[PDB]
């Protein structure tokens, strides 16, 4: 998941688009509205079945709180496309 | 903008642009019911005139809005990258 020579600066953006639970690019990104943290749907829903809190900041969170953060899905798709188009 | 080598990055630029002011998000707010995003001031001003999402027309009021803090970080990071890749 690396860029052509001289695009090391892209790492910051790549890192922002990765879930803190699984380290993969957001898959069906969900926001926790009370704290603005984001996770893959499956990742966060699995965590909340365990503990009803944000796995980053510890604020109380229940499953009905979660909302889709659709723009992150769009960004993941577009960044993957960009990266592959450049490596070509 | 991006040099020709990196023209594809315009796709990422486009996703970080507020649909009200056409500038990169400043203090991004998400409308949770529809997942569209706008600069905080842009959408709050719009809602004082018409209580709807500018893109999808669902009813929205100011108490609905939540910070989408990841977008501000993405804007900051992409600005850095762009400003250091002008001669790529
Ligand atoms: Zn995940
Ligand atoms: Zn949190
Ligand atoms: Zn705006
Ligand atoms: Zn909308």
CATH of the domain at B58: 3.30.40.10
Q: How far is B34 from chain A (nearest CA, A)?
A: 8
- Round to whole Å and give the CA distance between B13 and B2: 10
Task: Give the residue numbers spanning the domain of B71.
Answer: 1-88
Resolution (A): 1.8
A2: left (phi over 0), alpha (psi -120 to 50) or beta: beta
Nearest CA in chain A to B87: A6
Count of domains for chain A: 1
- How far, in Å, are A11, A19, A26, A43, B22 from residue A22 at the CA level? 17, 6, 9, 7, 34
Q: How far is A74 from chain B (nearest CA, A)?
A: 8
- How far, in Å, are A81, B12, B86 from residue A87 at the CA level? 10, 17, 18
SS3 track for chain A: CCCCCCCHHHHHHHHHCECCCCCCECCCEEECCCCCCEEEHHHHHHHHCCCCECCCCCCECCHHHCEECHHHHHHHHHHHHHHHHHHC
Look at B70 and A7 and tell me if their CB atoms are within 8 Å.
Answer: no
- Round to whole Å and give the CA distance between B55 and A13: 26
- Round to whole Å and give the CA distance between A45 and A52: 10
Look at A7 and B84 and tell me if their CB atoms are within 8 Å.
Answer: no
B87 Cβ neighbours under 8 A, 6+ residues apart:
B3
């Amino acid at each position: 998941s690396r860029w052509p020579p001289g695009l090391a600066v892209m790492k910051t953006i790549d890192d922002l688009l990765r879930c803190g639970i699984c380290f993969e690019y957001f898959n069906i990104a969900m926001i926790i509205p009370q704290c603005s943290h984001n996770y893959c749907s499956l990742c966060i829903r699995k965590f909340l079945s365990y503990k009803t809190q944000c796995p980053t900041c510890c604020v109380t969170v229940t499953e009905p709180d979660l909302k889709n953060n659709r723009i992150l899905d769009e960004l993941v798709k577009s960044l993957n496309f960009a990266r592959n188009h450049l490596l070509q």
